Design a protein around this ligand. Structure first.
Ligand SMILES: CCCCCCCC/C=C\CCCCCCCC(=O)O[C@@H](COC(=O)CCCCCCCCCCCCCCC)COP(=O)([O-])OCC[N+](C)(C)C
Ligand SMILES: CCCCCCCC/C=C\CCCCCCCC(=O)O[C@@H](COC(=O)CCCCCCCCCCCCCCC)COP(=O)([O-])OCC[N+](C)(C)C
Ligand SMILES: CCCCCCCCCCCCCCCCCCCC(=O)O[C@H](COC(=O)CCCCCCCCCCCCCC)COP(=O)(O)OCCN
Ligand SMILES: CCCCCCCCCCCCCCCCCCCC(=O)O[C@H](COC(=O)CCCCCCCCCCCCCC)COP(=O)(O)OCCN
Ligand SMILES: CCCCCCCC/C=C\CCCCCCCC(=O)OC[C@H](CO)OC(=O)CCCCCCCCCCCCCCC
Ligand SMILES: CCCCCCCC/C=C\CCCCCCCC(=O)OC[C@H](CO)OC(=O)CCCCCCCCCCCCCCC
Ligand SMILES: CC(C)CCC[C@@H](C)[C@H]1CC[C@H]2[C@@H]3CC=C4C[C@@H](OC(=O)CCC(=O)O)CC[C@]4(C)[C@H]3CC[C@]12C
Ligand SMILES: CC(C)CCC[C@@H](C)[C@H]1CC[C@H]2[C@@H]3CC=C4C[C@@H](OC(=O)CCC(=O)O)CC[C@]4(C)[C@H]3CC[C@]12C
Ligand SMILES: [Ca+2]
Ligand SMILES: [Ca+2]
Ligand SMILES: [Zn+2]
Ligand SMILES: [Zn+2]
Ligand SMILES: [Zn+2]
Lengths: 675, 55, 675
């Protein structure tokens, strides 16, 4: 039971001011005139009177989009400050032209008319403003330590951040870009890249910068979709500041630009150089052509080596043929690797240092070619780009393992000369180490074949999606490792008092890899291995029993093991499944764009003339006119895009408002004529 | 003025009698009073600490 | 290169007819008059001329909602057939009144004006039509063999079905129900039930009948939400054609009606009879009150038996107290069942026919009370309702098992007198069979405790959701069983040649329940058991080996087992998981309504005065004025609902059309006045 009052009271204006505001709002070309005369003579009305909701007479007239009252008030020298911004926001060209013809605010004090027009993206008002030689400030580098930036960040961080965001939002306007830039596509590429990089430095305002970068990418794509001819498309794609613009787009991660249908058709035409009407043929004949071209890989290569200008020697220069030949060569290498571990070719397993066999002699040139190709690619093409592939890491590991295997084999051959039973060799015998490294490198080289899946229309998107989920798998791995370490520490602390020697165990075997598992929690390493193997159910339940009858200790150990099993197998795995599902739901939307970007990147690596020969055979020893053409095509594209966007801007609300205003104007004119 | 309701757990005779005669009317009246009190415009107009009042 | 022509040409009308139609469409009170005069005199115009798009002049005027031309044409005796339907569909009251004042069509020939008005759900037009003593046909029973129905279904099934659907769609109109029914709530209940039952007989038009039933349910609920007082709510809920209307709603499956907040408050007030301000107390004190009331269950019952009118004897008549007492009694029975299988109370396991122990003597009265209560409930309350619970099946199985156990114990006690080692008893000893049946009944009785979860705010919805998924689990069971039978047949056919006797096996054990598993696929029963147990990984891999060296047979058996494992564990289980997820996604939306319906059904079973005592103690031996009140409250509710729906019918499109038409009319009037 407490009354309600007004705490922050507003100082009301007099009846004269209220009547003046009412007349201004209603619209009376004569009553407002006589009110202004009275204000001039007797000062009964304040010319600068303000509505309690901060709405002066000029603002009321602007919101009423009637220009006669505004012109009269301008002639009467009313306070005109901060009215051009209201006109711009209301998007009224006539009023904007009128004010351009010469406390409390709804706009921050850093906003300029040109910036506000750019935020609105109105081409007609932006052009009108830019016609009067306006400028826009440009911000400092993302990581800048200059005194002016440091002082600004030290006095008003909120103001600094808001000003930077406003400037970038103005600069990212498609209409401003089209009006003021000479290379709109390149400008959009660079601006999108800069905004994407800035979003992670200003982590608080991340979504705004993300949306600005998306806007720039959409503008570039939509500008590309306005091409009407193959000649125009080639002029756009081949412009050098052979497909220089496409390479720049790939560098700047313009996936929607690259995956556009007109670009994909050009790329496919370049890809199928020697097979006109490839999509006309049946899948059976295409498959048979693939097999026949694959089997002739040793030829077409010797021909290219002995006669590049010959008809046969020019066949391997086509991208699809080159890809098929490289694939066939890699498959042959893998088949020899398979042949290495067979009974047919490898015998006499009793020699300490064995000379290389025929299969190893055949294998060596492939390894040399792989290493030479990796080094040559890394030298020619950029060192910093070589590491942003995530497959070159596998290549490096595989080649390092092969080099270590060769070195260990040579060392063993030099050091050892004779025979000895394998059962009495030491643990660290060079032959044993070389065999282990060879097996690991075989696994890696066989797993490398995944990267060829992106060339297929059915397996490529699936491979991209799996590669996208791998990161979140890596995210869960951390929590799992922490839980595993905690429980391993506890179990080892409990059980380390009951260690036994291998002598007293059956068969003199110690650990969990024996037929009767024992000493599962005697050391930290063994405890970690046991807790890892219990995830798949390969650890038996009698490993929690000690030889003595310590029932309390055995029960505590069993309860520890059961709690670990519950936490690991009932909770963490199901949470992993749930978040896998959530990730795949979002990933499945953009699978096509990512797959086409990946396939374009894969195709573009076979276009150049470097590294034509497969690894087995690769170790044997005017500008102005182009600028005018680009400018003409850009003019046409910008005109078409602007016209299309203007015709799209026709909306029901705008049309209804325009018709209502026009009908009101005509009715007023007819009433005045009658009167 | 606007009436203000009793504590969430109140045993006063007036609350008990009201809940014993017309529970539907009592609940509807309480909900209407709280819906009126939770108005942003009313808060901004009549409160001196709108943030604390909203909290 | 083939030209395009017109195949189904329309016979065009003459220039006179085209001019007449143009004048009618444009609107000319004098030009149309002189055209009609010319048609009368020289017959230059056809009064019945039709637009090529089937649009006569009267239809054009109706779509123009100008009544002067329609009245003039009616005075001129133009073909007026099938125009009232167009007026009704356009929903123009003035035109409808005008035509009511006295080839090609867009309406099927079975549609009447009243049916069309009911389809539109316009209260103003429905009332206007019903004021003139109109009727609507009513259809025959869902399963009717009368000659007229058989002949109609034998001549035109499409026409018959369309007519039935149209009649039901007209009858299911909320405005028609409110206008013409004396008990709208009961009418909505019955109509929704009938439509729901009809949807599964007309399986082709299932969705239409489902939507009609949903419409009826929504109407009944929305009518209920218009109560403003507890007295009105009690009048509505207690009306008998003690909560008769609520019981009818429960019988007709009106979940949204029952789960409404005003009804739930009344039910909670009835439920907490002896605890005013129950929700005011803390959860700790509420819990402690629950425990104390539970422990005093033997008392409050003897008090009710020896003095029902006493202050102590009237406590058990409250529903919450009765529920707590029954729960405590059941928990005591389960605790005695737990005590049955302990070392403290049961000894001397060597007697063939043993006399009952003290725990069994204590157990027997509970079983007798359970059986008596089941029989009494089944007699008093309806036999056909007793089977639609799906818990009474568990009750019946449990009580049958207890009866069989008692009978077998009595038979064994009568037949056997002496002692014998248990190891030399036969397979079918009555004591062994009775023990097995007792254990199974113990499992069932312990599992019965699930039904008490619906009383809790956290476990109830979860239990309802699981019970909803059980049906789809049952759906997958069929496919799994078929696959299992196929593979069992194949494996038994392959392996039945290598059966071995138990004598030659170690420990003289035969089957897969031995320590060394053998004869896994020797018989069909054993093959089925092995293939069942392989789902959980409890079958070892050496069971596919025969004693002889038949490598082809062993490999074929291993491949069969591997194919079965892949199909069962990699495909079917993952599909089950996927469809579980899909089912839960839809189930999670309406969990609250279903849970509240279930809790209301559970609460209502403790309101009546029959079966007050728990099973241990239950074996010891005017209408007119109510009608006027209901009619008044129904009048108020219908008026409020109609007013609310009318105020909700205000839409932007309708308001804009009305304002445009009114402005056009006023402009025309002003122009005529000026002229
Ligand atoms: C991941 C990226 C890197 C990939 C691998 C690059 C380097 C490859 C090869 C490195 C070869 C090291 C030298 C081997 C001989 C020298 C020697 O004395 O070895 C000592 C240790 O030797 C070992 O324990 C062998 C370890 C080999 C690497 C195992 C992991 C490979 C992962 C592969 C990826 C999965 C012998 O023991 P001791 O001193 O007698 O005591
Ligand atoms: C589900 C709904 C029904 C529930 C159960 C109601 C009926 C309960 C009890 C039925 C009792 C049958 C009579 C037992 C003694 C008579 C006799 O000679 O038995 C013969 C067979 O005996 C058996 O094989 C026992 C079978 C008992 C039922 C097992 C399934 C219970 C499922 C419970 C639900 C899960 C002895 O063999 P023989 O003739 O010597 O050769
Ligand atoms: C005593 C030691 C004994 C060891 C025994 C085991 C030896 C073998 C170990 C194998 C380890 C895992 C190897 C996995 C190979 C396949 C990788 C996944 C393939 C896939 O679908 O994802 C690709 C990623 O692969 C990649 O990026 C390739 C990652 C290569 C890592 C190499 C590490 C060495 C996608 O392709 P993408 O790269 O485009 O993905 C997006 C980048 N933004
Ligand atoms: C030699 C033989 C050896 C046998 C050894 C095993 C013996 C025990 C066998 C146990 C078989 C399964 C028992 C399951 C008990 C719980 C049932 C599920 C509970 C649940 O959440 O769902 C309720 C359904 O329960 C129900 O409807 C209860 C179903 C009772 C079936 C009894 C069959 C006998 C929902 O409740 P709801 O009924 O409202 O569900 C909607 C009806 N529209
Ligand atoms: C980070 C992740 C946060 C997750 C936090 C939740 C953890 C759940 C902990 C549950 C403890 C279960 C311990 C059971 C146990 O050790 O028994 C072994 C020992 C064996 O010696 O058994 C017992 O001591 C008690 C036997 C009865 C156990 C009842 C089972 C209840 C557990 C339900 C889990 C559902 C499967
Ligand atoms: C109704 C459901 C429709 C589903 C239809 C699909 C069925 C899948 C059939 C796959 C056959 C797998 C048979 C493998 C087998 O029997 O090996 C046992 C035998 C053991 O003797 O092994 C072999 O004969 C070949 C060994 C290599 C097998 C390669 C594994 C490929 C299977 C991938 C499955 C993924 C897990
Ligand atoms: C699962 C087992 C059988 C793998 C055996 C290894 C190789 C025989 C496979 C592994 C990946 C395969 C490659 C995966 C995808 C492609 C792309 C494919 O190109 C297309 O499909 C082009 C037409 C299109 O775009 O659809 C040509 C075959 C090739 C190189 C495949 C050749 C055969 C490869 C090397
Ligand atoms: C998992 C183990 C511990 C089960 C042991 C068996 C019994 C001790 C449990 C099983 C189900 C329980 C019942 C489940 C739900 C309820 C409803 C509950 O009622 C409310 O919560 C009312 C208030 C509300 O609506 O939230 C009162 C206890 C009771 C009967 C529980 C009493 C104790 C029961 C019989
Ligand atoms: Ca590489
Ligand atoms: Ca029952
Ligand atoms: Zn700076
Ligand atoms: Zn109070
Ligand atoms: Zn009939």
């Amino acid at each position: 039971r407490i009354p309600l009052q007004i705490v922050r009271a507003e100082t009301e204006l007099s009846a004269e001011e209220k009547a003046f505001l009412n007349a201004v709002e209603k619209g009376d070309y004569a009553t407002v005139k006589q009110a202004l005369q009275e204000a001039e003579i007797y000062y009964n009305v304040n010319i600068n009177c303000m509505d309690p909701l901060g709405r002066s007479a000029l603002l009321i007239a602007i919101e009423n989009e009637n220009l006669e009252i505004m012109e009269l008030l301008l002639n009467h020298s009313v306070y005109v400050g901060d009215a051009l911004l209201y006109a711009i926001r209301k998007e009224v060209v006539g009023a904007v032209e009128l004010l351009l013809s010469y406390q409390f605010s709804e706009f921050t004090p850093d906003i300029t008319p040109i910036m506000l027009a750019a935020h609105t993206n109105n081409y007609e008002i932006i052009k009108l403003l830019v016609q009067k030689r306006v400028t826009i400030p440009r911000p400092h580098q993302i990581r800048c330590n200059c005194v002016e930036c440091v002082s600004s960040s030290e006095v008003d961080s909120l103001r600094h951040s808001r000003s930077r965001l406003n400037i970038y939002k103005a600069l990212a306007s498609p209409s401003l870009i089209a009006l003021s830039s000479e290379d709109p596509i390149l400008t959009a590429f660079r601006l999108g890249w800069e905004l994407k990089e800035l979003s992670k430095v200003e982590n608080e305002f991340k979504a705004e910068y993300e949306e600005l970068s998306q806007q720039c990418k959409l503008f570039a794509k939509d500008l590309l979709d306005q091409a009407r001819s193959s000649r125009e498309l080639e002029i756009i794609l081949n412009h050098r500041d052979d497909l220089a613009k496409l390479k720049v787009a790939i560098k700047y991660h313009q996936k929607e630009f690259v995956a556009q249908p007109n670009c994909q058709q050009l790329l496919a035409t370049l890809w199928y150089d020697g097979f006109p009407g490839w999509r006309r043929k049946h899948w059976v004949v295409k498959l048979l052509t693939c097999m026949t071209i694959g089997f002739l890989f040793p030829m077409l290569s010797i021909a290219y080596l002995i006669s590049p200008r010959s008809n046969l020697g020019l066949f391997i220069k086509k991208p699809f043929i080159k890809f098929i030949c490289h694939t066939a060569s890699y498959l042959t290498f893998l088949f020899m690797l398979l042949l290495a571990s067979q009974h047919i070719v490898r015998t006499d397993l009793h020699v300490q240092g064995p000379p290389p066999t025929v299969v190893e002699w055949m294998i060596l040139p492939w390894v040399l070619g792989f290493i030479w190709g990796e080094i040559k690619e890394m030298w020619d093409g950029g060192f910093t780009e070589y590491i942003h592939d995530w497959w070159n890491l596998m290549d490096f590991a595989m080649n390092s393992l092969y080099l270590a295997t060769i070195s260990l084999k040579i060392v063993a051959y030099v050091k050892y000369n004779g025979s000895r039973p394998r059962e009495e060799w030491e643990m660290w015998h060079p032959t044993l180490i070389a065999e282990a490294l060879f097996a690991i490198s075989n696994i890696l080289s066989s797993l490398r074949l995944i990267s060829l899946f992106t060339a297929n229309s059915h397996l490529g998107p699936l491979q991209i999606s799996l590669g996208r989920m791998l990161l979140d798998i890596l995210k869960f791995l951390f929590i799992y490792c922490l839980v595993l370490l905690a429980f391993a520490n506890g179990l080892n602390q409990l059980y380390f008092y009951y260690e036994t020697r291998a002598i007293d165990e059956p068969n003199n075997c110690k650990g969990i890899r024996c037929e009767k598992q024992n000493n599962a929690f005697s050391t930290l390493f063994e405890t970690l291995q046991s807790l890892f193997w219990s995830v798949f159910g390969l650890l038996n339940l009698y490993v929690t029993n000690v030889k003595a009858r310590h029932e309390f200790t055995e029960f505590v150990g069993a309860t520890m093991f059961g709690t670990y099993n519950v936490i690991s197998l009932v909770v963490l795995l199901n949470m992993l499944i749930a978040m896998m599902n959530n990730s795949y739901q979002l990933i499945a939307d953009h699978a096509d764009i990512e797959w086409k970007f990946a396939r374009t990147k894969l195709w573009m690596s076979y276009f150049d003339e470097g590294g034509t020969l497969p690894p087995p055979f690769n170790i044997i020893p005017d500008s102005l006119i182009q600028n005018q053409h680009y400018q003409e095509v850009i003019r046409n594209l910008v005109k078409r895009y602007v016209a299309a966007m203007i015709r799209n801007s026709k909306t029901h609300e705008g049309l209804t408002e325009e018709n209502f205003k026009e009908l009101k104007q005509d009715i007023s004119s007819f009433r005045y004529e009658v009167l």
